[PDB]
Write a protein that binds this ligand. Structure first.
Ligand SMILES: Nc1ncnc2c1ncn2[C@@H]1O[C@H](COP(=O)(O)OP(=O)(O)O)[C@@H](O)[C@H]1O
Ligand SMILES: Nc1ncnc2c1ncn2[C@@H]1O[C@H](COP(=O)(O)OP(=O)(O)O)[C@@H](O)[C@H]1O
Ligand SMILES: Nc1ncnc2c1ncn2[C@@H]1O[C@H](COP(=O)(O)OP(=O)(O)O)[C@@H](O)[C@H]1O
Ligand SMILES: Nc1ncnc2c1ncn2[C@@H]1O[C@H](COP(=O)(O)OP(=O)(O)O)[C@@H](O)[C@H]1O
Ligand SMILES: CC(C)C[C@H](N)C(=O)O
Ligand SMILES: CC(C)C[C@H](N)C(=O)O
Ligand SMILES: CC(C)C[C@H](N)C(=O)O
Ligand SMILES: [K+]
Ligand SMILES: [K+]
Ligand SMILES: [K+]
Ligand SMILES: [K+]
Lengths: 499, 494, 496, 220
């Protein structure tokens, strides 16, 4: 995929270089210290020089015994980009295409992703050079457990050191094996041993709302910009999801959830694309009907309430285009043909920097992956917090909140019944059907959804304010990288460098 | 060929030789194909470096500017903990260089029975471009980054100085570790070797590699079996030698061989060479190089045009640089013994020519392990928290005096009142040993015992696998046999 | 007879504690009344008697066929007056909490008599190793180590296990490897968590011969003492001494080899299935080679087949080097031997001990004689703490001093007499030359064991004279051990 | 009482055996893995066999000095039924009727009691074989503190390892002494040292509503 593409490693480096030169001049004049103007330039440029490269990169070579008895030496890597926030955070990829450069580029990208959504972790990324399709579940458990042991001994796993997560190639059963190995061996004496890894099953300390997390983040990211009338009038559109049409490229976990949440708020799905074929219906595509067909047949091709679209969904006449497939699909060759006004990156690096130039020229707003694709990172922070807390969210306050709500309604009821007397009869103040469902179904997922919504709302306004401060307009990607570099710089500047 | 490819090829050669003997020596409840897989599978685990750490740490120059420094540290094996290996400060350091030297250290430790796995660090800077204050900052910060990732610790990884590093850097590494993360460790100062005496260093560290080169040559030169093959007499009597590279190793090797009767005919250096068939005094040459900076212009020696490698002598000691003896100059070497007092001075293609010409090459794996041996003793000294002999020198002296007094009192009874008093007193040489009894004596003997024991192990391995004068292959087979045994008997976790 | 070995050890302690009690009160110099001193002494002895900690385990294992099995395990730590605790691991379906507790308590007193600074401990995994593959036994050993480590029942400074007749050096190696790579990863002494390890894993040279050499040195110290030998109507030394060994195992073979080396003649060797006898003498090397090629000593060409047990053989020294409770009150009045050297734990019942005292038959107890292996396990533990083999830095130094000593005698004599009849070469003997050339760690371990057995024999002899026990060496050994364990408690005090 | 009755230990074992055979067949078909049907039966039955017994049982023999000066050796036990959830949780009983079987049965009962109310702790139970009526408040402090020390050294007390609690024979003051000994000795460097034991007074870190807790639970 494009997270394994060498062109994507150069892209993330270029995004940092662009943002660092923009933020540089403002960081010098904002610095109030006993230094000359050339001493201030060296301090700013020098800290940004520290931020750019990966602080640590560990290369491993560990043994494994196959189920047939033969031995195999496995290659592995883990890069920790920055420790200005500890622990480090980042997924583990099981692919024969993993490399040191890939692991370093994705580690750097996680530093700036966390920074835009105010998630207090440094960037990190691991890669085990194996094809999981070639191994038994028993062999994959041995690889996972041995890899965890090698990381733990060298400080590349730990609740306060480095917290890995699953990728597209790894799942919740892998994360469970990592947590179990750690809590049983090196982290045995640690009360927060299970906070060493996120993406764990519910039985092992995983948060509710992890599966929907990236899709809800894509929804909230779009929602924050679509409701802003300032940006929408620039794109020649009305604010809100009313009379909005959208197309999703990639019907995976992110694609399905993004389609479900936008449809729930009034938007109409015009076309859904996939690796093998595309589907299109201008009248509308129901996400629940499409989900049931995809689960029963394996593919969206052949959906009864949609015609087969010949080609990519990227050029469908819609308002919002959501690339939910991790591929450099929007390039300079197809950017002048995109009929959408908003491009919502629900995957890492779906648009090339040359296409970005064309979208800016065409007044097409691209909400960047750095912000929009940070919903899963946000709830991984909540999972890490849940494990530190050793309690599910709301466990001690759902009933308390429910009683206070009933007291507030009974107070309005008595107050009014007193004002109008017994002649005006009883005035029953009861919860709505929707509020009654919320009270009865009150669980942890309700708080994880709220924390994610608050994070996406707060970060959208930060990116909007950074865009106005540096006069970037519709260049939201540059605003996001400048926002992230500004935050990382501030930690280094106020903490200082030891020795 | 690259030195990193060379050490890999040495391992591959030794692993295929030892493989068949490791299968039949294995007594377990397995089929013959299950035994082949177990041996080949364990050999596959040993060959690559287990861990490699790449660093990028900040530094603030004395002028105020910031600089990001690159650094690496490879831990080739942990079959023996801690890992051991030097730190190089050079702009020419690389991951491959650090990996090759880490693997080489694994096998080098194994041949001299030093219980450490191999390791090697490299900081990509030119020390000539930095002040002593800047070098202290780089050293302290590098130590902190290694410490947080398990690449320095008394029981984890013990670094050492290199040609680009000194005892003052080691002192800063030990102080940084003991004052920050290793504060709660009683053995914190055993985290690094090569330290000054005031910081917990062993006496005899400076002479260690030179003494090892001497003892390595001494063990083979005094073996009549090998010497008759080379058409030579055993011992250093009537032996002529030439040293290439007049550094710390070159100076000490020349001094110790001369002390035992060997005559130095030629001394080579980076810029020029010196030659005198009548003999070159090591003390006179040492004083001239310390007063002038170079050996060129030595009054009791003519200026030799070219490398010392082709001088008509018996023992050639390349005590400096990598790949000096190559396939192009090997058919012109007049020496019958090539004592490698540096890492990788002869290419594998030159090794083939030396075997064809019946020229015995004592390998770097064994001969250049004197410094590694006393670094083990320094690590032990720090764990002991006492200098060697501190509580037994006086006790030993009094026991010696009682022994001589017993011989005297017994002989005076046998010869009674006619042979008067028969004073049994120590010789002048023994009296000097008693009076000058210090730690250095125990380190020197501990190193001599290691070189003697390891020479016999290599000789026995050479006879077992019928290698003859191929001592390098014997040394790698000896090391692979030892590392394999640790893995086979311990097992692999998970 | 057949008393429970657990009850035996308890009775030995009770006997020794009541003997030492009166002497411990008058030796106590403190600001207390005489009844306060009696309570303090009796109170400390009440603390020493029972096991301080006993851990019962139930851990999972996955068989090679895929099925799961829950394994039972135990480990008792009798005392922590000396840390770490020390004690073997038994893999047998016959292990029990009482067995593990009795052997742990026995180990405390065994260590105390040989001045080995460890408290007593003993583990037992309730499995029959014959029913498991080498892979399954690895899993059991590694998992058992993990469960002990997490609860403080393994560690270089907490508890150091060792092999038993049912476990070996490969299991010890797996224990060390599991500890060094999981819980004890950050510990510099992680390989000192277990003893009985192979040489490649940090084992001492001389471990295999250790118990046999200890049996030899134990007998040697009493056999050379003319005071004790005249009581038994015998001459001092191994000259004209005949001996018989019950059980031809590791202890039996080595004890037979070392006694024969010093002049003693082996008249009979017994085994689980049959016995061998030759009054002219049995060569230990010839018997060892036949036992390694056939499996059993039955059919040895230079020995007739003896019908019955070797305990009733006409010899001077009887050595029960195998089995428990072999000498009972029913066969004690028929022992023609005059010295019974216990090469195994609990081979004679307390009722047989009474008969041997009545018959003036000296029994050297297991508490002392069977402590050779414990002594070198202490040296292995120290070797791993030292991180160096014994003599590594001093063999060459010692060798040079020896040359200088002989050269000083030669040069001093050459000055006194001159070269009238030539030079007077003072060179080493053939035996000294062999010692110099073969100088290795095993020589220092053998010396350390010999010094320990010599020192402890004199301590037991002095205790026997102090309390007028005579030939009751077992009571002398338990009184010696209780006196030492009490002293540690009395001078340290009890926390809270 | 009923918690010391041998018939109750057999009772709990039977409840587990009944539940394990009922849940067994449904656990095999719900398992979606790359295994044969006999490999799935062994995996389900093997896990059930692991759950049933107590993982660890520690037996103690610790000294105590009575107020009159005499010494006494106290017997004690602590079983940790399961560590699928850490820390373990369970009360401490001070009774001459405590036994290894009682401590094992109540530890196992605790595991299932915690799982039904989604409390993330494994089962545990301790018993000190003494009659508190025979000891002074000073002697009971010594017993409590020394028992705490013996459990702490062997991993049978700690906020992330095992968190004891009171029962009908122990109180909040004993819990307060347990926390105080742990915080001032073994857990001195632990920021959550006072979380090693529950049932503590309010001044020592106890929750409000502990006294009414069982009664409100019965009501709800
Ligand atoms: N990954 C990060 N790197 C740098 N700064 C960060 C990071 N995450 C958050 N910050 C910043 O650090 C500060 C944390 O303050 P706080 O109010 O506690 O956080 P928040 O309100 O974002 O949860 C904020 O200024 C926030 O923007
Ligand atoms: N670096 C090493 N790797 C593997 N085996 C080693 C290493 N160093 C020593 N050994 C071997 O381990 C064993 C250690 O046993 P010991 O007698 O204590 O050591 P030594 O006599 O060499 O000091 C010997 O067989 C020795 O050859
Ligand atoms: N296991 C033990 N239990 C109690 N006391 C012991 C034990 N081992 C040794 N001692 C005693 O402790 C003291 C240790 O003193 P030290 O002279 O250092 O020992 P040693 O000379 O026996 O090596 C001696 O009195 C010794 O007899
Ligand atoms: N003691 C326990 N043993 C096993 N599973 C438990 C235990 N306590 C809780 N669980 C389960 O573990 C999961 C924990 O998920 P989470 O939602 O964080 O917990 P909860 O909502 O119960 O507070 C739930 O499935 C819960 O039923
Ligand atoms: C932001 C800080 C954690 C940076 C740290 N002080 C350093 O020296 O790199
Ligand atoms: C020789 C041992 C240190 C090997 C170790 N068990 C490993 O898995 O690497
Ligand atoms: C001898 C000491 C280790 C005794 C210890 N103070 C205890 O209370 O058991
Ligand atoms: K950085
Ligand atoms: K390796
Ligand atoms: K005790
Ligand atoms: K259990």
């Amino acid at each position: 995929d494009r997270e394994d593409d060498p062109n994507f490693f150069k892209m993330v480096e270029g995004f940092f270089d662009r943002g660092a030169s923009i933020v540089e001049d403002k960081l010098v004049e904002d610095l109030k210290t006993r230094e000359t103007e050339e001493q201030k330039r060296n301090r700013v440029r020098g800290i940004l020089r520290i931020i750019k490269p990966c602080n640590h990169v560990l290369s491993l070579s560990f043994p494994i015994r196959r189920d047939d008895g033969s031995w195999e030496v496995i290659e592995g890597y883990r890069a920790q980009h920055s420790q200005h926030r500890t622990p480090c955070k980042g997924g583990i990829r099981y692919s024969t295409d993993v490399s040191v450069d890939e692991v370093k580029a994705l580690a750097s990208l996680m530093t700036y992703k966390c920074a835009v959504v105010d998630v207090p972790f440094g960037g990190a990324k691991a890669g085990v050079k194996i094809n999981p399709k070639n191994y038994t579940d028993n062999e994959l458990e041995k690889i996972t457990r041995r890899f965890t042991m090698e990381l733990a001994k060298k400080g590349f796993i730990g609740p306060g050191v480095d917290v890995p997560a699953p990728d597209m190639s790894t799942g919740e059963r892998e994360m469970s094996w990592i947590a179990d190995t750690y809590a049983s061996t090196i982290g045995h004496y640690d009360i927060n041993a299970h906070a060493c890894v996120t993406g764990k099953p519910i039985s092992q300390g995983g948060i509710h709302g992890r599966i929907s997390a990236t899709g809800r983040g894509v929804f909230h990211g779009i929602e924050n910009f679509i409701n802003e009338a300032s940006y929408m009038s620039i794109l020649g559109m009305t604010p809100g999801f009313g009379d909005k049409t959208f197309a999703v490229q990639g019907f995976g976990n992110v694609g399905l959830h993004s389609m479900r949440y936008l449809h729930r708020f009034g938007a109409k799905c015009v076309a859904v694309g996939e690796s093998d074929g595309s589907i299109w219906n201008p009248d509308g595509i129901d996400p629940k009907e499409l989900e049931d067909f995809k689960l029963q047949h394996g593919t969206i091709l052949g959906f009864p309430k949609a015609k087969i679209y010949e080609g990519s969904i990227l050029e469908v006449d819609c308002d919002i285009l959501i690339p939910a497939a991790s591929e450099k699909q929007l390039t300079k060759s197809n950017a002048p043909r995109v009929k959408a006004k908003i491009i919502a990156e629900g995957a890492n690096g779906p648009t090339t920097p040359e296409a970005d130039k064309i979208f800016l020229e065409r007044n097409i707003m691209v909400i960047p992956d750095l912000y929009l694709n940070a919903g899963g990172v946000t709830v991984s922070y909540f999972e890490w917090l849940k494990n530190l807390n050793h309690v599910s969210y709301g466990r001690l306050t759902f009933k308390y909140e429910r009683d206070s709500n009933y007291h507030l309604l009974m107070s309005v009821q008595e107050s009014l019944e007193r004002k109008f007397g017994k002649h005006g009869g009883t005035i029953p103040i009861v919860p709505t059907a929707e509020f009654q469902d919320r009270i009865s179904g009150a669980s942890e997922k309700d708080i994880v959804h709220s924390g994610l919504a608050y994070t996406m709302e707060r970060s959208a306004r930060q990116i909007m304010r950074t865009a106005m401060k540096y006069n970037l307009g519709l260049d939201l990607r540059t605003a996001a990288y400048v926002n992230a570099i500004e935050k990382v710089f501030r930690v280094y500047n106020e903490a200082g460098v030891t020795f």
